[PDB]
Design a protein around this ligand. Sequence first.
Ligand SMILES: NC(=O)c1cccc2c(O)c(Cc3ccc(C(=O)N4CCN(c5nc6ccccc6[nH]5)CC4)cc3)oc12
Ligand SMILES: [Cl-]
Ligand SMILES: [Cl-]
Length: 240
Amino acid sequence: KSKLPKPVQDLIKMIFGDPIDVNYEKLKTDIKVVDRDSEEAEIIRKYVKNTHATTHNAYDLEVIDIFKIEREGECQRYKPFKQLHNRRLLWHGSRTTNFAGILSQGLRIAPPEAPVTGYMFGKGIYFADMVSKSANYCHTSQGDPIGLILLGEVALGNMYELKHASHISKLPKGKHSVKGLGKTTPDPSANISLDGVDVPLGTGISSGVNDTSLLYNEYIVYDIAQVNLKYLLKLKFNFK
Ligand SMILES: NC(=O)c1cccc2c(O)c(Cc3ccc(C(=O)N4CCN(c5nc6ccccc6[nH]5)CC4)cc3)oc12
Ligand SMILES: [Cl-]
Ligand SMILES: [Cl-]
């Protein structure tokens, strides 16, 4: 029987759908329950509450469990980007069935033989600052209403800021990432700092960006090493 805390056991059962502890080791990821009443937990629940987009009104989100995560060696891997400026705690949603691969291998760029459909800026690693924009990629339903979402520390550095789809072959010199400029943005004045990482948990305001394809921001890096996965949330989707 398992010596993991019950919430981590339930995460494992959800991810693998072998014994629980053997399946834990296959993730090559240190997993800790964040306490409900911790400051970390308050900040993350505030990020969820404030960055639910008005146009994503099919469901509300409740945070069941928050996990602090540490992929084996992802530290050493993140070293070259560790002190790059403009490091941001951003959402990445994916189907539950993907999380064993995501924790064991990290987030990866789609292979050349996958469609570029859905990628406004070409194959890369995509993040949102709006929880619901990322939560939509969990593909939960009323009959499967529990999903998994990541918070990554993303080393954005100098952002190549774009308003329309463009499959860039190469970042301009001195740029580290792409930011797709949305009509709606977390209020920059409400940004807070968690462990030297910027958290844009401000409620959505008009960006005052005109002539843009995007309702909401998105952030893209083309190097797997610019991502340090920090948290994994188990979300209840309440469908209306
Ligand atoms: N995701 C965001 O939070 C997110 C945040 C902000 C903006 C965007 C934006 O435009 C996208 C694009 C997107 C997502 C998904 C897919 C898609 O169909 N797949 C990619 C993931 N696959 C996959 N199977 C896996 C199995 C094991 C291990 C890893 C695996 N990975 C399935 C195919 C296409 C485009 O996403 C955005
Ligand atoms: Cl979607
Ligand atoms: Cl590129």
